[PDB]
């Protein structure tokens, strides 16, 4: 009991609960028994019949059972470089979309300035451009001394005039 509990709790790089390790080992054992008996490998539906659970959960268990590989094992046919020399940095800054983002920021500033100051401020505080919070209609109402209904109408009017062909075409290429 101690050895098996410790194996379940410590053998894998990614910890797997014992309740799932038990089913993984049972699935593997009976699948190899079935292969030996039948002469061919058992299909997922056949294995699900013995698991008394659905083939979707059988496949989920199968893909759960996979283990990681080392980032430093030699990938080349000879020993020249490690697998870690072939993996990209997903989280790294692509360094060309940053320039696109800042220039689109400037263009959005200009387009907002094309509109009236009241509507521009309403949209800014409504979508969170000056700060991080896109405020609510009540907040813009209390900061502008105006009713929330009039705010809704001013937002709709602002959006209608913002739909205008030059603004739409100018912003469209930035995507």
């Amino acid at each position: 009991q101690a050895i098996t509990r410790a194996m379940a709790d410590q053998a894998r790089t990614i910890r797997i609960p014992v309740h799932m390790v038990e089913v993984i080992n049972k699935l593997g054992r009976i699948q190899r028994e079935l292969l030996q008996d039948l002469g061919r490998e058992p299909t997922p539906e056949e294995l699900a019949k013995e698991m008394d659970i659905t083939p979707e959960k059988v496949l989920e268990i199968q893909q759960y059972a996979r283990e990681p590989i080392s980032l430093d094992q030699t990938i080349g046919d000879e020993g020249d470089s490690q697998l870690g020399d072939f993996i990209e940095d997903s989280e790294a800054v692509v360094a060309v979309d940053a320039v696109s983002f800042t220039l689109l920021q400037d263009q959005l500033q200009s387009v907002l300035d094309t509109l009236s100051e009241r509507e521009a401020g309403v949209v800014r505080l409504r979508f969170g451009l000056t700060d991080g919070q896109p405020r609510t209609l009540d907040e813009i109402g209390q900061v502008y001394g105006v009713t929330r209904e009039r705010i809704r109408q001013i937002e709709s009017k602002t959006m209608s005039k913002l739909r205008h062909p030059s603004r739409s075409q100018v912003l469209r290429d930035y995507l």
Binding site: T13, Q63, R66, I69, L71
Partner: protein, 195 residues
Amino acid sequence: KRLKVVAAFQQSGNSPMGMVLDAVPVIPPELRPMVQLDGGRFATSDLNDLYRRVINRNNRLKRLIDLGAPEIIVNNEKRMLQESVDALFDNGRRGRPVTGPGNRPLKSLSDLLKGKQGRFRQNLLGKRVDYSGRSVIVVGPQLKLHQCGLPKLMALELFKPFVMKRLVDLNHAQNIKSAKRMVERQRPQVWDVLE
């Protein structure tokens, strides 16, 4: 030969207590990344295995001493912990190295410093570098001495920010996104501005 270390300890402010360790540090996780490659398969940096081994041995030892056990059991656990720490820093310096799947040794901390393929030489003095290319060499007998003939496609790829900025200056594109598209499709309005 004994004084050349004893006097070194005496002269400075260091303390020979530094030889032994009560706590070991842990490298930041990004320096030992774990990432999912294409196909769902996972990849670890091979250092987390050594760290996991050390953690397991230490936790088991503390459980043993807090539960009460024969000194031979406790000493075996302590020896295992010491060997785990020695494997962490230097895998294979003492005895056979700890090996993973495929009967290959796990790379330890010092293993990423020593050697030509180690950090100091393969990664710090040398460096992979941007704005660079390569290709085969042909003779240019009609060139001048201060001159070299460069492929137009590779030159376009190399000078890409320069040419994109100049071509948006010439108004052939409205923005850098349009400029990047006409760079990728290599439209005829880029070749003349390339020169």
